[PDB]
Design an enzyme around this catalytic site. Structure first.
Site, PDB file in Angstrom:
ATOM      1  N   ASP A  84      -4.052   5.402  -0.448  1.00  0.00           N
ATOM      2  CA  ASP A  84      -3.526   5.878  -1.724  1.00  0.00           C
ATOM      3  C   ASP A  84      -2.004   5.687  -1.771  1.00  0.00           C
ATOM      4  OD1 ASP A  84      -2.262   8.342  -0.570  1.00  0.00           O
ATOM      5  OD2 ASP A  84      -4.345   8.980  -0.293  1.00  0.00           O
TER       6      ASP A  84
ATOM      7  N   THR B 110      27.360 -37.809  30.056  1.00  0.00           N
ATOM      8  CA  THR B 110      27.256 -37.623  31.500  1.00  0.00           C
ATOM      9  C   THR B 110      26.036 -36.754  31.819  1.00  0.00           C
ATOM     10  OG1 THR B 110      28.467 -35.535  31.790  1.00  0.00           O
ATOM     11  CG2 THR B 110      29.780 -37.522  31.429  1.00  0.00           C
TER      12      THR B 110
ATOM     13  N   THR C 121       0.983  17.472   8.672  1.00  0.00           N
ATOM     14  CA  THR C 121       0.913  17.966   7.299  1.00  0.00           C
ATOM     15  C   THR C 121       2.278  17.846   6.630  1.00  0.00           C
ATOM     16  OG1 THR C 121       1.521  20.266   7.816  1.00  0.00           O
ATOM     17  CG2 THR C 121      -0.805  19.668   8.031  1.00  0.00           C
ATOM     18  N   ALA C 122       2.280  17.690   5.313  1.00  0.00           N
ATOM     19  CA  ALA C 122       3.530  17.583   4.575  1.00  0.00           C
ATOM     20  C   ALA C 122       4.316  18.858   4.815  1.00  0.00           C
ATOM     21  CB  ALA C 122       3.260  17.404   3.085  1.00  0.00           C
TER      22      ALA C 122
ATOM     23  N   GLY D 165      10.004  14.133   1.466  1.00  0.00           N
ATOM     24  CA  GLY D 165      10.321  14.636   2.786  1.00  0.00           C
ATOM     25  C   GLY D 165       9.953  13.683   3.909  1.00  0.00           C
TER      26      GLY D 165
ATOM     27  N   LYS E 159      -3.567   5.293  -8.984  1.00  0.00           N
ATOM     28  CA  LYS E 159      -2.952   5.272 -10.300  1.00  0.00           C
ATOM     29  C   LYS E 159      -2.650   3.888 -10.869  1.00  0.00           C
ATOM     30  CE  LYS E 159       0.248   8.975  -9.426  1.00  0.00           C
ATOM     31  NZ  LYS E 159       1.183   9.628  -8.460  1.00  0.00           N
TER      32      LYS E 159
ATOM     33  N   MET F 226       1.095  21.028  -4.655  1.00  0.00           N
ATOM     34  CA  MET F 226       1.248  20.207  -5.859  1.00  0.00           C
ATOM     35  C   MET F 226       1.663  21.105  -7.014  1.00  0.00           C
ATOM     36  SD  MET F 226      -1.930  17.499  -5.776  1.00  0.00           S
ATOM     37  CE  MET F 226      -2.986  18.853  -5.236  1.00  0.00           C
TER      38      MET F 226
ATOM     39  N   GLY G 241      -2.455  10.553   3.020  1.00  0.00           N
ATOM     40  CA  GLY G 241      -1.159  11.129   3.327  1.00  0.00           C
ATOM     41  C   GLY G 241      -1.318  12.477   4.003  1.00  0.00           C
ATOM     42  N   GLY G 242      -0.352  12.837   4.838  1.00  0.00           N
ATOM     43  CA  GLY G 242      -0.413  14.110   5.528  1.00  0.00           C
ATOM     44  C   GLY G 242      -1.622  14.261   6.439  1.00  0.00           C
ATOM     45  N   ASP G 243      -2.344  15.370   6.270  1.00  0.00           N
ATOM     46  CA  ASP G 243      -3.534  15.677   7.066  1.00  0.00           C
ATOM     47  C   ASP G 243      -4.786  15.705   6.172  1.00  0.00           C
ATOM     48  OD1 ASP G 243      -5.021  16.504   9.355  1.00  0.00           O
ATOM     49  OD2 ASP G 243      -4.785  18.603   8.756  1.00  0.00           O
TER      50      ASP G 243
ATOM     51  N   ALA H  31       6.957  16.136  -4.378  1.00  0.00           N
ATOM     52  CA  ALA H  31       7.826  17.182  -3.847  1.00  0.00           C
ATOM     53  C   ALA H  31       7.088  18.441  -3.417  1.00  0.00           C
ATOM     54  CB  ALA H  31       8.882  17.532  -4.865  1.00  0.00           C
TER      55      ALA H  31
END
Ligand SMILES: Nc1ncnc2c1ncn2[C@@H]1O[C@H](CSCC[C@H](N)C(=O)O)[C@@H](O)[C@H]1O
Lengths: 455, 448
Positions: free
Chosen positions: B248, B44, B328-329, B402, B270, B373, B298-300, B428
């Site tokens: 990196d 229909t 920053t970390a 973190g 690495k 580090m 990474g970070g600043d 860390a």
């Protein structure tokens, strides 16, 4: 409308890519993310294709375009840099009604590959219709910033709450308001991504336990040193969802224009009267108790000479959820925009962030500071510029040690002045608040790294 | 992603819809607007279909579903009020490898129809896959007011100027610079909307007669500690329009996903590690080529890495460069672990660090220490700090990954330090100071 967008399910479905260069690799990566059963046909393959094959991600058919390869495929992409070969793939694809894309000729074939924003299962796609890929990327960039990272988590989670929602809220308008609140709950989304079941349960129950119209919480957001471009993606996302914003004077005008048109604003800074901290702490707690989503917007970073800890320790036995979004601190901002790295190969590795005088209750550590290769950065120290100059060379710091002052860092009116330590107090009467003092040998690097305009 | 969005060209291409009610009507309306050659099979039909049928806009096939009606189709849509017939349609479509959608059953068949926001030729699509239909409706509403009404005019004009742009400018950097000025011109946009061709031509002629720089650049960008939401607005802009990105291992994979999809990428790690001079070389070389190069760190960039080193030769080489700071970390890790770097009497000095180190200066106090580090020197740190005058009892904390969804935090005191450090791995951070005490009066991110 000149193209119809559709969202295809590709999990374990045959798709074909012809070509093996860098263009073919992007396409393959995308098709693979969607789970396609992929075959790649080319004369030669770049290293990444061997890797995928050697780990069972796809199938490689080295040689010239084999047309029978399309016989059981659902999608084809011509990714070679030979228009004649791309044309033959297109023609073979069209003959058997297989949607096909030709990389640098968007409308010569069956479909256009749009720019994508992935928050799976939620996804957004943008297309120029072939007119402006630059415009498509501009839109992607904007949309990526507006959609929080873990939006997918709650999209996927909604299913496990639908029933309870229909059970407690019987009016269409009520259930809609629930989802509106549910879908902008960033703490819940994060907790789900963290695989933190207790927080997920805690935040879930609260959504049903609290009055529908309440969205009580406190968010500390670091606005950065001034440049609106330095705010974080999460900070902007938070600021666009605020019911009320409590900010101070070191929060830029450009930043406040990003705040949600009619969220209430409460200025707690120095007016042309000092608002005591306990009153500020109390307004945050109070209005969160009233059910509002509160954003405490702080200059630079919340936990660095920002008194952010105080505005939170007042929230734990209030039962008010909270969170923190760090921001670019003045030290980082001024460093990058003045061409003065805080750390450089030998000069470096001890960076000290120290307070000056407006902020007291004991007294300053001269040789501990006047001590060797560490870069010194003073916050709120313009009123003791000379008093810092005298007490530094007095304790051993060599008078020819470079120094610099940065006023209104990262802003369109940034002023950078520099010289040697015996000129400190003098270079300071050449600047006004807010400013930072940087003492250390890294200052000389500016002769090579300066890139931002001075005023 | 559980679905791949694509934009189909349906002009003069056969499509089939099974069903003839309201659901089928909205579907048919879109396909017609896309210019599809439509056939509608239904027991229909409602009025609008008859309207379309006698205006020669489509073909109607009255009666039960016929499997052979799919034989020359590119798309199939099942929209009947019968679940049984609807899957006879999808089963038939699948045998012929024809993408198919069953409107009231999104988890079935092979494609889903997204919500659309139209600004032709510019178009935006959004969908939940059927998981959160309310989420998509809400987003479509927001996107309708966010996108200017006449954005399609600007996009259309851009396409028309494409041929002239290429013939007036040789290098990629000026053609790229042209478009940036183009899409930022409010007079041009307002002029197109007010169909004032005089104004459009006047402005257009000036953009073409402008001297645009042809050289590339190197932009250092802080990715932050891991959480993609901590990237700055400008950092996102830079990775979104770069020609090539050098990164990196401390750039989270989530942040790497925000990078322009058609940009090249060079891992500097690495795999050793493109010994700086090697990385330093990649940068100036790619920029020399006229590319917009982004060194994502990474970070600043001016606190943690060898950012200064990576730029200190570019001025000599005549290569433009800029720096976009990042979280920053130290700031991210500390904040996400519930530890503020400063509080009222607690600190007036914050120290970021890293044979030697000046232990008596790092051990005195009224300060908060942060070691960058230092996991394999961790045992010697407490020993030296304790020997140079630091209070056993002083709290310390180590943070692993973190800010990420995999974050981990161990806590203790100077004496347990060397131990805690074997309770975690890299990358860390180590936080020494009193502020580590109000960690659970302020902990907000995770319970681990
Ligand atoms: N845009 C800017 N340029 C230079 N210094 C700034 C600045 N913004 C803030 N400051 C510094 O910060 C001091 C106030 S204390 C607040 C610091 C902020 N929480 C942060 O993390 O950066 C000012 O006295 C000034 O020394």
């Amino acid at each position: 409308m000149d193209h119809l967008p559709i969202f295809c399910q590709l999990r374990d479905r045959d798709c074909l890519i012809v070509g093996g260069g860098d263009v073919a690799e992007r396409k393959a990566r995308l098709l693979l993310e969607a789970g396609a059963r992929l075959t790649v046909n080319a004369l030669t393959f770049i290293p990444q294709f061997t890797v995928w094959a050697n780990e069972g991600m796809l199938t490689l058919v080295e040689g010239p375009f084999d047309e029978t390869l399309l016989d059981s495929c659902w999608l084809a992409i011509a990714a070679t840099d030979d228009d004649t070969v791309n044309q033959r793939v297109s023609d073979a694809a069209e003959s058997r009604r297989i949607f096909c894309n030709v990389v640098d000729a968007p409308k010569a074939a069956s479909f256009i590959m749009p720019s994508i924003i992935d928050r799976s299962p939620l996804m957004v796609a943008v297309s120029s219709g072939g007119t402006s890929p630059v415009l498509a990327r501009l839109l992607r960039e904007k949309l990526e910033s507006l959609l929080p990272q873990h939006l997918g988590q709650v999209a996927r989670y909604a299913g496990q709450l639908r029933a309870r929602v229909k059970k407690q809220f019987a009016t269409m308008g009520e259930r809609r308001r629930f989802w509106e609140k549910f879908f902008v709950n960033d703490r819940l989304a994060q907790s789900l991504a963290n695989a933190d079941e207790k927080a997920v349960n805690a935040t879930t129950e609260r959504l049903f336990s609290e009055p529908l119209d309440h969205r009580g919480e406190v968010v500390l957001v670091g606005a950065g040193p001034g440049d609106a471009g330095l705010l974080t993606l999460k900070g902007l996302q938070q600021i666009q969802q605020a019911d009320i914003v409590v900010y101070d004077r070191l929060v830029s005008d450009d930043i406040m224009n990003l705040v949600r048109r009619d969220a209430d604003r409460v200025f707690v800074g120095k007016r042309a009267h000092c608002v005591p901290q306990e009153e500020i702490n109390q307004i945050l707690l109070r209005e969160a108790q009233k059910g509002k989503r509160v954003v405490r917007l702080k200059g630079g970073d919340p936990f660095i000479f920002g008194r952010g800890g105080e505005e939170l320790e007042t929230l734990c036995h209030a039962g008010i959820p909270f969170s923190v979004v760090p921001g670019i601190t003045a030290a980082s901002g001024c460093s990058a925009y003045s061409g003065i790295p805080l750390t450089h190969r030998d000069y470096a590795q001890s960076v000290r962030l120290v307070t000056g005088h407006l902020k007291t209750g004991g007294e300053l550590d001269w040789e501990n500071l006047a001590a060797e290769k560490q870069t010194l950065v003073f916050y709120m120290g313009l009123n003791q510029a000379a008093t810092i100059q005298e007490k530094l060379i007095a304790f051993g710091m060599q008078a020819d040690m470079p120094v610099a002052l940065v006023e209104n860092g990262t802003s369109v009116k940034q002023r950078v002045v520099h010289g040697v330590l015996t000129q400190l107090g003098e270079l300071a009467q050449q600047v006004e608040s807010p400013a930072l003092i940087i003492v250390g040998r890294v200052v000389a690097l500016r002769d090579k790294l300066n890139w931002f305009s001075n005023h």
